[PDB]
User: Fold this.
Amino acid sequence: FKLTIGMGDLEMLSSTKYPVVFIILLVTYIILTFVLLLNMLIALMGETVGQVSKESKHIWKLQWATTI
Amino acid sequence: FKLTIGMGDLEMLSSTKYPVVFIILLVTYIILTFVLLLNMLIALMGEESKHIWKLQWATTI
Assistant:
């Protein structure tokens, strides 16, 4: 978790006896983490850039009626 | 490379004889790297609307 933010000390690499695959696995972990976070980022930005969508706010009217 | 994730410590900028221009050349490095990394992601992982949901699902059948 600390390495995901950018505060992780690379000390577990020497912990394992097999660093050649461990480093590759770790690097894939950060690559996938960034891919997932940025996919979420574009998801939010595309959802919020339109403001009012055709399918959107029909949901909102639905929950408003349901709550009433 | 560690600067891209931020793990590595940035004590190297204290050794340059011209910190005024090294910092400028490093800020543009970070911006260029971030843009160049974001572009491939938005080009590959992103991608008409239901084309994928139709074709990729029909492939499984």
Q: What stands out?
A: Residues 19-49 of chain A form the longest helix (31 residues). The two ends of chain A are 43 Å apart (CA to CA). Residues 9 and 52 of chain A are 45 Å apart (CA to CA).
